[PDB]
């Protein structure tokens, strides 16, 4: 008993409000709108610049010193839209409340997909790994202060533009951390330190690799561009570095690794930190090759030009036979934290031709709080004697600066 316009308005309003309500993580990720918004279905590889770091320029005369600086880009592939294709039945459309219930159920699945993607990307791409044999709690003597350690490691490392980080707990560790939650939203947002809890934080399975050592002396340098097969210049994603190892058995995407001698550096000040350099493998290429999500650029590397050395983030390079420590020795449900632009959500409006083809009524909407662009379409089918309804969300989550994304792993007793 709902007319067409009423169907469209109620559905779009329900989708927008419920997705903006039940997406805590996706609202903490920076919203990126591609500069080139065109009506094309092919997914372009958007190259967003990362912050430029330059060597210290001192003195009155600076001749030919602006030139030669490196500008590096990171790539995001939006891919294909996330759809929820279902049928609208008579009981759904009998009144406004039932229709809102059905549309809420659909948009709840879409918000599931967005949050699951963000949480999994943060857990499997986060490299600022902090572990402790103890469990998270308020007991100073025997428990682990995840928030304090995360803040300390982000401050020491200087990867936070001084706007604060975002800490996400899983409900078990949020309960153990003694957060009152009575004066807080369901997620802990203080409705009208920003510590929140999410139920979609994955459990990071243990890694069984034991005897892993670096295969040979390997040094990585930030490369601005490379020639593709056509001969044109294409930027190089300077996040991931391929490391040759003795063996990669028992290594999977998301495993957090560290190297024996390699240490963090203060990102801006280039001073050696106490904490060992922690990396996350994003892909296992071969039996002897892995791909770690922050690229280890060594200060002591003499082959680096000063412009390249301005991006150094580790104490030393990888030696001939260097032990590869495994941080996720035990199964633990992840707690993640990231700073500023560590995760970006890239989305542009879905190309559509409204009111052009009779039978299909497509309405294009946008969720401003989350930064997702979508389309809502209905059509009638006689193979089901019901109105097909489709909700699409076209977005791409990118983990820009994986060095700024952290994973907290409690109870790594080993």
């Amino acid at each position: 008993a709902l007319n067409e316009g009423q169907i469209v308005t109620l559905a779009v309003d329900e989708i927008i409000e419920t997705i903006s309500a039940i997406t805590p993580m996706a609202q903490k990720a920076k919203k990126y709108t591609p500069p080139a918004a065109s009506m094309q279905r092919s997914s372009n590889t958007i190259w967003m610049p990362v912050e430029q770091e330059s060597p210290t320029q001192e003195g009155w005369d600076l001749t030919d010193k602006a030139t030669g600086l490196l500008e590096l880009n990171v790539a995001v592939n939006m891919g294909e839209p996330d759809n929820d294709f279902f049928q609208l039945r008579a009981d759904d459309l009998r009144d406004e409340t039932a229709y809102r219930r059905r549309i809420q159920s659909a948009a709840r699945k879409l918000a599931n997909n967005v949050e699951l993607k963000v949480a999994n990307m943060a857990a499997e791409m986060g490299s600022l790994v902090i572990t402790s044999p103890d469990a998270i709690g308020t007991n100073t003597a025997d428990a682990w202060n995840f928030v304090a350690d995360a803040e300390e490691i982000m401050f020491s490392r200087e990867l936070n533009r001084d706007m604060g980080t975002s800490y996400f707990f899983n409900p078990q560790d949020y309960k153990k951390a003694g957060y009152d939650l009575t004066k807080r939203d369901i997620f802990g947002r203080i409705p009208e330190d920003d510590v929140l809890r999410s139920p979609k934080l994955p459990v990071l399975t243990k890694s069984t690799a034991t005897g892993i050592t670096v295969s040979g002396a390997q040094s990585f340098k930030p490369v601005a561009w490379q020639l593709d097969n056509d001969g044109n210049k294409v930027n190089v994603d300077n996040r991931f570095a391929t490391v040759t190892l003795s063996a990669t058995t028992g290594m999977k995407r998301g495993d957090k690794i560290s190297f024996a001698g390699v240490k963090f550096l203060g990102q801006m000040a280039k001073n050696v930190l106490a904490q060992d350099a922690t990396f996350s493998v994003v892909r296992v290429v071969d039996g002897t090759h892995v791909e770690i999500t922050p690229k280890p650029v060594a200060l002591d590397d003499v082959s680096l030009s000063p412009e390249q050395r301005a991006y150094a983030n580790v104490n030393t390079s990888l030696a001939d036979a260097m032990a590869v420590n495994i941080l996720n020795v035990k199964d633990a449900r992840t707690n993640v934290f990231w700073a500023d632009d560590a995760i970006r959500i890239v989305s542009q409006p879905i190309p559509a031709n409204h009111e052009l083809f009779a039978g299909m009524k497509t309405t294009s909407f946008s969720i401003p709080d989350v930064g997702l662009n979508g389309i809502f379409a209905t059509q009638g089918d006689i193979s089901t004697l019901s109105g097909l309804c489709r909700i699409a969300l076209w977005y791409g989550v990118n983990a820009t600066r994986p060095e700024a994304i952290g994973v907290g792993l409690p109870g790594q007793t080993a």
Binding site: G5, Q6, T9, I16
Partner: peptide, 30 residues
């Protein structure tokens, strides 16, 4: 009071098919 009149305006906007006006009026109602 005026809540019942803005509810009628919301219903008219919804029947017309304007999502933006419906959402603005819903925010006004709350």
């Amino acid at each position: 009071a005026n809540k019942d009149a803005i509810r009628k305006q919301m219903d008219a906007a919804a029947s017309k098919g304007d999502v933006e006006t419906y959402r603005k009026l819903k925010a006004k109602l709350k």
